[PDB]
From a paper:
Particular hotspots for the mutations are the angiotensin converting enzyme 2 (ACE2) receptor binding domain (RBD) (15 amino acid substitutions) and the N-terminal domain (NTD) (3 deletions totaling 6 residues, 1 insertion, and 4 substitutions). Most potent neutralizing antibodies target the ACE2 footprint (Dejnirattisai et al., 2021a; Lan et al., 2020; Liu et al., 2021b), occupying ∼880 Å2 at the outermost tip of the RBD (the neck and shoulders, referring to the torso analogy [Dejnirattisai et al., 2021a]) and preventing cell attachment. Mutations in Omicron knock out or substantially reduce neutralization by most of the large panel of potent monoclonal antibodies and antibodies under commercial development.
Interestingly, the epitope includes several residues mutated in Omicron from the early pandemic virus (including Q498R, N501Y, and Y505H). The neutralization result was confirmed by measurements of the binding affinity, 177 pM and 204 pM for the early pandemic and Omicron RBDs, respectively. To confirm the structural basis, we also determined the crystal structure of an analogous ternary complex formed with early pandemic RBD.
Author numbering:
A (entry chain B): 1 to 214
B (entry chain E): 333 to 517
C (entry chain H): 1 to 135, 142 to 221
D (entry chain A): 1 to 228
E (entry chain L): 1 to 212
The structure:
């Protein structure tokens, strides 16, 4: 079993940069190495074979080189669509541990503040016994964001979960949804519900809020 | 029924390595050659000095069937006047060969995932083989000035090498089963 | 005395199929092997296939293997060649040849006159006839450009002119069409006094053009 | 062009046998002339080559997967299968059926790379039962309005196992849509949300329906979202 | 495959001369070598089979000899109906039958310089978008002749097509017609159009040109 080592594990580059990914083999695999591109929610896509031969239908800006133990994938002129995780695969012998650990390429872009939205629980959900309040952070960069649930100005913790979309393939932004889940009874005990958002693009924290009944 | 046992050669479960190629004499029988080729599979079918269709005309039937396995790249060496590691050191046909060479891809039989290392070929030999010569010796080959005395090492190599047929090889490195029929007229 | 007559040749687009025939006479057709041999325009001879006397055996050259098919009908004394998946490299004149049979090996002793097979993605278009006016003796002629397929027949003054006339073999240009030249050396004196008209005839498109050539 | 498509149960109880099927679709192309294999990917992990079928009796199986892997190819139906017995939580992964690229004439490699892939199917090894999701509307309002654009969506809550697919207006509405990954609630059930931003002037005139499809429970819900 | 190499590719003789053609095989083909004659526009005709066996009906002035790799076809007395191309064909590899490159037996005459003529494109053709320049080499011997298209003293390659007639049935000379083809846009880009001709009968290369 030959082990493959990609470096770095993660990287962030601006649009148009020249990205380089290195793949290291514990022993010489001659030139039988392949490169894959896997976008989120998609199967891996074969880019390079024989370390340097380009697959049909892959842009010319992708290129590979190397022989023996160290190989290199190059992405000239990085595009926002190129956001993906890239794997190298040795195929000198059918053995376990054939793929590398993968290199996740993030796209670097200008700072963008999120558009914040809050959603009260629906009548259909309130008539099922549960209450879920949803806070939305739409189209922002960078990925780091902080959400605080305040219920009647009382800070909440341990009753909510977050979920962040993968980086958009067009504008390279992120989106976040925080779901505050309560019982209908506990929801019926308080009036004001709000999520407070802090981000690099907000000079002051934004707070969307609603009142139960209004 | 007194038909020639051409099935025992073409349909053999195991084939011989090319350096120790197998030979089966087929005589005193009625050979049905028309049906022999009919099995649409043979990727290589070349005859020399005889026409395949007009083999049912020969009164007698006294033929040698030689069988072995080589690379797909080496199929072209099984012919008169060819050179290379196989034709020089493994299986040599004469220049006035009277017979047919039959070969077919056998990647589905003679290749294992880890590599089928059962088929060997002679890599080192001082002089070329005479036609239809069979060298099965594995004496340590002396490549340099000092002798070897049966001991491997530098300039002292085992004369045979294995193919290591893997199913992921290209057709040039894939195994092909070869049958060589030698006619007499 | 042996008679071999081919038929079925013509034009075919790439990837399509075409079938040739070869009627035999004046010999025991059912006891001889039959061959097919093709010759590219301006190239050498290339063997294609062979079939046994009874039609049970068929062997093909590597350039056509798995692509052509040979067959025979001993009740009609006809040889067939089913040509599927035709490439541009298949454009040639196809002969059927009888095997001599006097040897342990094949050899062709009688050939048919052959038939032309043109593999191209161009439909039958008529030619454009352009003059070549002159500027010792003088020279003039006609340029037969952009026609498909072969052939075209060029005569001068309806056959009244045959001395000092040269008609050149056509060429296959990059457009998949054909271009042909035809010239004549006439006395330089009788230049603006004698009439010269080339008679171009394209049978595949039925185009009989008579263009007058004058300085 | 060759196209692969996985199909199988997204939920398998522990110690049972996983069974998936990949159907080869092409221009009358025979599956007897190619090799076929399977590749899985645990959630948040790398890629593991499970095994490839070359010929009958000449198969490769990942030795780390012991003797519990079996792959069969049906050449008359143009489809192949993957059998994985004695499954545990370590077998919960997205499974891809891939085709190893045929080698060139002079290729000497020991293994191969995979040039054609399926779409992947998510198999969860768990003891729990399947549950269809409850789809609740996230109505647009003044609090969910930024200028001339407004946000609305659907809350897909309490389902098991993964995954669910959300489309808006039968796929006619794709721009500005964000389907967030699902979070595993303390109850052991998944829950995600899907949102779309629309112009404010279209809320009363345009109908917006989210189409939630939970294959493991054969549950399809089309929920119309209106301003409250 | 077994390669068949004939030599010479062409030879010139007169009626009554003894002609000898050589055919070599890349490997020993024993005695299964056959000779064929082909006139232009006609099917080939079998002359010799099995190296030396004369086919029934063929004149006894043809004969073959040799075995192994070197073979010979000899015409003891060349007759006027024996000016043709001659192919050898090996039959040892019965399922990989191959022919030679051919040997043309042409008529021997004296050296004749070509009469070079150049024709500019016609007015009728220029309205179609394409321009064809034609250069003519009329009645020369031997066939070896070079045609070079100059445009503003810049050599043109991959831009023209040649065509040579068969050896004339009367003066035994050849004739060539080269056709330079370029678009109308490439036609006004330049002005001078020339045609340089090199031949054995020319003490110096001859050029015929015209100005647009
Ligand atoms: C080699 O064995 C194969 C079977 O493995 C034989 O093929 C069969 O031949 C019979 C006629 O005898 C046919 O009816 C069958 O359809 C054939 N089956 C297959 C799978 O080919 C073959 O005849 C044998 N060859 C020799 C020379 O004995």
């Amino acid at each position: 079993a030959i082990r493959m080592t990609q470096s770095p594990s993660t990287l962030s580059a601006s649009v148009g940069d020249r990205v380089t990914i290195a793949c290291r083999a514990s022993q010489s695999i001659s030139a039988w190495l392949a490169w894959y591109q896997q976008k989120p929610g998609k199967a891996p896509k074969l880019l390079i074979y024989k370390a340097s031969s380009l697959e049909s239908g892959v842009p010319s800006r992708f290129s590979g080189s190397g022989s023996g133990t160290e190989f290199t994938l190059t992405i000239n002129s990085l595009q926002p669509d190129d956001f993906a995780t890239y794997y190298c695969q040795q195929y000198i012998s059918s053995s376990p541990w054939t793929f590398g650990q993968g290199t996740k390429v993030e796209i670097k872009r200008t700072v963008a503040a999120p558009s914040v939205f809050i959603f009260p629980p629906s009548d259909e959900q309130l008539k099922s016994g549960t209450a879920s309040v949803v806070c939305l952070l739409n189209n922002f960069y960078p990925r780091e964001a902080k959400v605080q649930w305040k219920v009647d100005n009382a800070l909440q913790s341990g009753n909510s979960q977050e979920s962040v979309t993968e980086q958009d393939s067009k504008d390279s932004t992120y989106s976040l949804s925080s779901t505050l889940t309560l019982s209908k009874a506990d929801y019926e005990k308080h009036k004001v519900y709000a999520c407070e958002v802090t981000h690099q693009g907000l000079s002051s924290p934004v707070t969307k809020s609603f009142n139960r009944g209004e | 029924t007194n038909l020639c046992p051409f099935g025992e050669v073409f349909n053999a479960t195991r084939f011989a390595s090319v350096y120790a190629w197998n030979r089966k004499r087929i005589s005193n029988c009625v050979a049905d050659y028309s049906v022999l080729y009919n099995s649409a599979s043979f990727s290589t079918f070349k005859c020399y000095g005889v026409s395949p269709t007009k083999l049912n005309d020969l009164c007698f039937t006294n033929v040698y069937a030689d069988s072995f396995v080589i690379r797909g790249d080496e199929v072209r060496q099984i012919a008169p006047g060819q050179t290379g590691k196989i034709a020089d050191y493994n299986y040599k046909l004469p220049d006035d060969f009277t017979g047919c060479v039959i070969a077919w891809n056998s990647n589905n039989l003679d290749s294992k995932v880890g590599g089928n290392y059962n088929y060997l070929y002679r890599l080192f030999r001082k002089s070329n083989l005479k036609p239809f010569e069979r060298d099965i010796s594995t004496e340590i080959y002396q490549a340099g000035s000092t002798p070897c005395n049966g001991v491997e090492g530098f300039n002292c190599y085992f004369p045979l090498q294995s193919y290591g047929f893997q199913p992921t090889n290209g057709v040039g490195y894939q195994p092909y089963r070869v049958v060589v029929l030698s006619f007499e007229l | 005395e042996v008679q071999l007559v081919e038929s079925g040749g013509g034009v075919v687009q790439p990837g399509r199929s075409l079938r040739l025939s070869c009627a035999a006479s004046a010999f025991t057709f059912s006891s001889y092997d039959m061959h097919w041999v093709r010759q590219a325009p301006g190239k050498g001879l290339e063997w294609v296939a062979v079939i046994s006397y009874d039609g049970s055996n068929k062997y093909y050259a590597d350039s056509v293997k798995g692509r052509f098919t040979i067959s025979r009908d001993n009740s009609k004394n006809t040889l067939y060649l089913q040509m599927n998946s035709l490439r541009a490299e298949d454009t040639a004149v196809y002969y059927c040849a009888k095997d001599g049979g006097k040897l342990w090996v094949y050899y062709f002793d009688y050939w048919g006159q052959g038939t032309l097979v043109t593999v191209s993605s161009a439909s039958t278009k008529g030619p454009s006839v352009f003059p070549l006016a002159p500027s010792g003796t003088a020279a003039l002629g006609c340029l037969v450009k952009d026609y498909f397929p072969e052939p075209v027949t060029v005569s001068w003054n309806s056959g009244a002119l045959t001395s000092g006339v040269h008609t050149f073999p056509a060429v296959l240009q990059s457009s998949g069409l054909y271009s042909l030249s035809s010239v004549v050396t006439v006395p330089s004196s009788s230049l603006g006094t004698q009439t010269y008209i080339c008679n171009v005839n394209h049978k595949p498109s039925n185009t009989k053009v008579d263009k007058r050539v004058e300085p | 062009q060759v196209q692969l498509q996985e199909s199988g149960p997204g939920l398998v109880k522990p110690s049972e046998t996983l069974s998936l099927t990949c159907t080869v679709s092409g221009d009358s192309i025979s599956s007897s002339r190619y090799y076929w294999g399977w590749i899985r990917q645990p959630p948040g992990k790398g890629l593991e080559w499970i095994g490839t079928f070359y010929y009958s009796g000449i198969t490769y199986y990942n030795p780390s997967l012991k003797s519990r892997v079996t792959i069969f190819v049906d050449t008359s139906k143009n489809q192949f299968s993957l059998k994985l017995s004695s499954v545990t939580a370590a077998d919960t992964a997205v499974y891809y059926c891939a085709r190893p690229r045929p080698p060139d004439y002079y290729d000497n490699s020991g293994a191969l790379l995979f040039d054609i892939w399926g779409q992947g199917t998510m198999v969860t090894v768990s003891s729990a039962s399947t549950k269809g999701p409850s789809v609740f509307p996230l109505a647009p309002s003044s609090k969910s309005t930024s200028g001339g654009t407004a946000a609305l969506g659907c809350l897909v809550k309490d389902y098991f196992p993964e995954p669910v697919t959300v489309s808006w207006n039968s796929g006619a509405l794709t721009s500005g849509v964000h389907t967030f990954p699902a979070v595993l609630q303390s109850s052991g059930l998944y829950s995600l949300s899907s949102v779309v931003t629309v112009p404010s002037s279209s809320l009363g005139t345009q109908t917006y329906i989210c189409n939630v499809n939970h294959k493991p429970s054969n549950t399809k819900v089309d929920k119309k979202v209106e301003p409250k």
